[PDB]
Write a protein that binds this DNA or RNA. Structure first.
Ligand SMILES: [Mg+2]
Ligand SMILES: [Mg+2]
Ligand SMILES: [Mg+2]
Ligand SMILES: [Mg+2]
Ligand SMILES: [Mg+2]
Ligand SMILES: [Mg+2]
Ligand SMILES: [Mg+2]
Ligand SMILES: [Mg+2]
Ligand SMILES: [Mg+2]
Ligand SMILES: [Mg+2]
Ligand SMILES: [Mg+2]
Ligand SMILES: [Mg+2]
Ligand SMILES: [Mg+2]
Ligand SMILES: [Mg+2]
Ligand SMILES: [Mg+2]
Ligand SMILES: [Mg+2]
Ligand SMILES: [Mg+2]
Ligand SMILES: [Mg+2]
Ligand SMILES: [Mg+2]
Ligand SMILES: [Mg+2]
Ligand SMILES: [Mg+2]
Ligand SMILES: [Mg+2]
Ligand SMILES: [Mg+2]
Ligand SMILES: [Mg+2]
Ligand SMILES: [Mg+2]
Ligand SMILES: [Mg+2]
Ligand SMILES: [Mg+2]
Ligand SMILES: [Mg+2]
Ligand SMILES: [Mg+2]
Ligand SMILES: [Mg+2]
Ligand SMILES: [Mg+2]
Ligand SMILES: [Mg+2]
Ligand SMILES: [Mg+2]
Ligand SMILES: [Mg+2]
Ligand SMILES: [Mg+2]
Ligand SMILES: [Mg+2]
Ligand SMILES: [Mg+2]
Ligand SMILES: [Mg+2]
Ligand SMILES: [Mg+2]
Ligand SMILES: [Mg+2]
Ligand SMILES: [Mg+2]
Ligand SMILES: [Mg+2]
Ligand SMILES: [Mg+2]
Ligand SMILES: [Mg+2]
Ligand SMILES: [Mg+2]
Ligand SMILES: [Mg+2]
Ligand SMILES: [Mg+2]
Ligand SMILES: [Mg+2]
Ligand SMILES: [Mg+2]
Ligand SMILES: [Mg+2]
Ligand SMILES: [Mg+2]
Ligand SMILES: [Mg+2]
Ligand SMILES: [Mg+2]
Ligand SMILES: [Mg+2]
Ligand SMILES: [Mg+2]
Ligand SMILES: [Zn+2]
Lengths: 211, 38, 142, 59, 174
RNA sequence: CUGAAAGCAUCUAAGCGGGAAACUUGCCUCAAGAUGAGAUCUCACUGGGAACUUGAUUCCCCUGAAGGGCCGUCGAAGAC
RNA sequence: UGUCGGCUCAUCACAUCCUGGGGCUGAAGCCGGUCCCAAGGGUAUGGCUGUUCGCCAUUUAAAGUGGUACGCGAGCUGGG
RNA sequence: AGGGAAACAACCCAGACCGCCAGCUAAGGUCCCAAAGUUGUGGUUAAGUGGUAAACGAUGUGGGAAGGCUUAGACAGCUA
């Protein structure tokens, strides 16, 4: 863990092995990341490195944020991310590329999932609908009971109701790297990765792995 | 082990002891005479 | 002739430092709460904050008598069903030593807007030093 | 309120409230609690003389 | 209190250093035994050693006898260390000593290895006997007991690791 | 395990260990309105006058930056 | 102050049904009996009947016992 | 009606004509919330007993009045 790269989800595809099996693969494009600031114990408490990637037009970078990108001669990119490193050295102006990963190499991919605006309890919480016949009155996909009588006589906190299947951040753990394309800056990963095409994804070494 | 409210010796080799504020019977002769509570 | 009342604009306040390094938890806290309220001054009025500032340095070395070290328990609820949570004196000294003295003193103060201003004048630390040398606190024996 | 303030003033002179009242009744003094609480705040030098009068009564 | 009224009878070649309550015994082939005493205990150095009590309380009386026995073990250990015997009963059970690693095959799928802490030494004169040696009773008896819980003895056939003087209760199938 | 009160025995009274899906972490997410409102990097603003109830004061003129918003083209973001 | 059963959605106790750790056994092994600790997570589909229940058929690691207005009709039904 | 019993018609104290920024007491109390003893002398408890309980069980500990053995060797151990 503790050090990774920021990329963009390009889409899903497949690759065929020689023995005939097909591997479902998600392509991730990782343009080289640029070290923006190094955070240590004697300056910040914790210990981490700060990273930027992409490209940003000069009219959208503000004066405060431009002088931060100019302390380290880095040039502005879209967004800024921070990786909480364990014991590593990085000078301001360094490069971090896909070349810190190998084949095999279980990795964790963090992204922001697709957004389903305002969802019911069947879609959100996997509830089961009532009857579609046999006398049911306008109560087909509604939740049902949400408590008890006088005792408590209130709805308990954390009750499952409807609203906003999230465009929140999730991580999928223990995904296998199939191929690393150093020259084209690609990272072919076996499985599915959260989010839509063109979104930012964080790729870090496997948190668990072990077996 | 036998958990009762009336623990007491069952033969010569039984031994009433009090361990962490609980009365127990430990017997070297027969492992069937162990008792707790009481 | 009308009874004197303290104006909150000209109240005299002093800084003291007390060492909680072997003292009983409950007998240390009653004296702390007595100073935070002003019950040691003849200007005490029940509706102004006229006490002093207290600094406690060696919080983790406070002690309790009997079997309370392993048996005294601390409870709090989170608002969700089955959200009752527990901890004991032994484990809370390791986890957060300062919360032990603040919890004892906090329950001995009034539970109203004024009782929360008096609690704001207590500083509890776990070392042998405090950041308040600019105020020059004086030594207070229990 | 008067009692709580005589209590604070007596202990600065080394005496509790209950031991002060016992001494005051013992000597002869019969000043109110309303006037005693007023001297404790303002005329502190007069309150001190009354307190050490109550101690001198061996109470 | 008959244990507390008995001297220690320190052997010929030893040394007693007494700086406050902290006490030590020096000896041969093993030395440097240390412990301190509760503030309720008396030790009177002489050509021998004697134990008394500051107080008359009940706890102080019970702890006087523990001090006499604990120091006595310290005295014997530096002179004549304590030693424990373990026997193995059952086919295919064998133990071999290798420096500070003792390997035991006790019928499991995988042979196990026991690590001997500093101090004690184990050596196996046979392939079914273990000899634990050391300088303190508490550490020697702890490691011996740690080697027994791998396979404590069975009543039907006696298979397992047993002490060389432990009586094993036996029985027969119904 | 060592060990007495109670020459023995004894896991306990002083001392030292092993031990479960329960407990605290480890995994994921939210999280300084944590009014106890934390920390880091960078950026901006460097004029006069009067009245006083004489300093965290009031008014007048000039100057309004860093930046934010309105607006418009939209979006795998969205009831607004 | 709308009273049985079904449906949807639950929440807690432990006097534990399964999984977890142990003592005794009239415990050889594979199986069991009984008691102790343990509430983290799980804990059937149908035929008959308005049924809860029950009896059958075939499964399961197991098909727990209870409190919540015998939980739940300004959430549904309306067979009794 | 007032004070106490946390809150608490029927329990304890006590029966409100009005005003006072005066004093003494009852029940109940005097470490902090919260008015008043971290008061003095002699003991008991280690159970947070105090701050919920029965038959029954136990070398928990304080006090008291008497017994049986015992330097002709008592009681535990250890050797026949
Ligand atoms: Mg959407
Ligand atoms: Mg259905
Ligand atoms: Mg119907
Ligand atoms: Mg209709
Ligand atoms: Mg319809
Ligand atoms: Mg729910
Ligand atoms: Mg029972
Ligand atoms: Mg235990
Ligand atoms: Mg409140
Ligand atoms: Mg012994
Ligand atoms: Mg033993
Ligand atoms: Mg102990
Ligand atoms: Mg452990
Ligand atoms: Mg574990
Ligand atoms: Mg499992
Ligand atoms: Mg629990
Ligand atoms: Mg903030
Ligand atoms: Mg801040
Ligand atoms: Mg601008
Ligand atoms: Mg913006
Ligand atoms: Mg839109
Ligand atoms: Mg409950
Ligand atoms: Mg149970
Ligand atoms: Mg069970
Ligand atoms: Mg079980
Ligand atoms: Mg079992
Ligand atoms: Mg069993
Ligand atoms: Mg449960
Ligand atoms: Mg549960
Ligand atoms: Mg359950
Ligand atoms: Mg857990
Ligand atoms: Mg059925
Ligand atoms: Mg039918
Ligand atoms: Mg019922
Ligand atoms: Mg019910
Ligand atoms: Mg009902
Ligand atoms: Mg029910
Ligand atoms: Mg309803
Ligand atoms: Mg309905
Ligand atoms: Mg109904
Ligand atoms: Mg309703
Ligand atoms: Mg209705
Ligand atoms: Mg309706
Ligand atoms: Mg009909
Ligand atoms: Mg009908
Ligand atoms: Mg009343
Ligand atoms: Mg009551
Ligand atoms: Mg009342
Ligand atoms: Mg009086
Ligand atoms: Mg009285
Ligand atoms: Mg109140
Ligand atoms: Mg008071
Ligand atoms: Mg006292
Ligand atoms: Mg209690
Ligand atoms: Mg109780
Ligand atoms: Zn027995």
């Amino acid at each position: 863990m503790t050090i990774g790269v920021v990329g963009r989800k390009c889409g899903m595809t497949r690759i065929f092995t020689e023995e005939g099996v097909s591997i479902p693969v998600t392509v991730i494009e990782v343009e080289p990341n640029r070290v923006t600031q190094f955070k240590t114990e004697e300056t910040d408490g914790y210990r981490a490195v700060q990273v930027t990637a992409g490209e940003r037009r000069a009219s959208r970078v503000t004066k405060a944020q431009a002088g931060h990108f100019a302390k380290a001669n880095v040039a502005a990119g879209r967004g800024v991310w921070e990786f909480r490193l364990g014991e590593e050295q990085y000078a301001a102006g360094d490069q971090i590329t896909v070349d810190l990963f190998q084949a095999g190499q279980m990795v964790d991919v963090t992204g922001e999932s697709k957004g389903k605006g305002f969802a019911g309890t069947i879609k959100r919480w996997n509830f089961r609908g009532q009857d579609n016949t046999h006398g049911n009155s306008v109560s087909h996909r509604v939740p049902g009971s949400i408590g008890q009588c006088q005792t408590p006589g209130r709805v308990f906190k954390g009750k499952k109701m409807s609203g906003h299947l999230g465009a929140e951040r999730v991580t999928v753990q223990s995904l296998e790297i199939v191929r690393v394309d150093a020259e084209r800056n690609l990272l072919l990963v076996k499985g599915a990765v959260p989010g839509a095409t063109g979104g930012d994804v964080i790729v870090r070494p496997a948190a668990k792995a072990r077996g | 082990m036998k958990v009762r409210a009336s623990v007491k010796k069952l033969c010569r080799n039984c031994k009433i002891i009090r361990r962490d504020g609980i009365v127990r019977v430990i017997c070297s002769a027969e492992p069937r005479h162990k008792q707790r509570q009481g | 002739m009308k009874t004197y009342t303290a104006k909150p604009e000209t109240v005299q306040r002093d800084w003291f430092v007390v060492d909680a390094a072997g003292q009983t938890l409950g007998r240390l806290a009653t004296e702390i709460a007595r100073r935070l309220r002003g019950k040691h001054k003849p200007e005490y009025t029940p509706h102004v904050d006229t006490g002093d500032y207290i600094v406690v340095i060696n919080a983790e070395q406070v002690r309790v008598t009997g079997a309370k070290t392993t048996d005294k328990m601390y409870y709090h609820h989170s608002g969700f069903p089955g959200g009752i949570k527990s901890i004991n004196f032994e484990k809370l000294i390791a986890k957060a030593p300062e919360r032990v003295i603040e919890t004892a003193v906090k329950g001995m103060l009034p539970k109203n807007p004024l009782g929360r201003d008096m609690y704001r004048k207590l500083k509890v630390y776990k070392g042998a030093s405090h950041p308040h040398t600019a105020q020059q606190p004086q030594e207070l024996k229990i | 309120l008067w009692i709580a303030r005589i209590n604070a003033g007596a202990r600065q002179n080394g005496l509790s409230y209950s031991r002060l009242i016992a001494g005051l009744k013992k000597a002869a003094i019969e000043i109110d609690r309303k006037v005693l609480a007023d001297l404790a705040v303002n005329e502190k030098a007069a309150f001190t003389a009354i307190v050490e009068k109550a101690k001198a009564s061996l109470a | 209190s008959r244990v507390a009224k008995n001297p220690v009878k320190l052997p010929a070649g030893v040394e007693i250093k007494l700086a406050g309550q902290q006490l030590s015994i020096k000896g041969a082939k093993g030395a440097l035994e240390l412990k301190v005493h509760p503030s309720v205990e008396v030790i009177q150095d002489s050509g021998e050693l004697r134990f008394a009590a500051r107080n008359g309380d009940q706890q102080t009386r019970a702890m006087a006898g523990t001090t006499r026995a604990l120091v006595n073990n310290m005295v014997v250990g530096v002179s004549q260390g304590f030693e424990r015997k373990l026997q193995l009963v059952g086919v295919g059970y064998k133990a071999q000593a290798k420096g500070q690693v003792l390997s035991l095959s006790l019928g499991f799928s995988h042979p196990v290895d026991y690590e001997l802490p500093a101090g004690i030494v184990a050596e196996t004169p046979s392939q079914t006997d273990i000899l634990i040696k050391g300088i303190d009773k508490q550490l020697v008896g702890q490691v011996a007991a740690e080697i027994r819980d791998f396979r404590p003895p069975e009543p039907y056939k006696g298979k397992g690791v047993r002490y060389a003087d432990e009586v094993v209760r036996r029985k027969e199938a119904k």
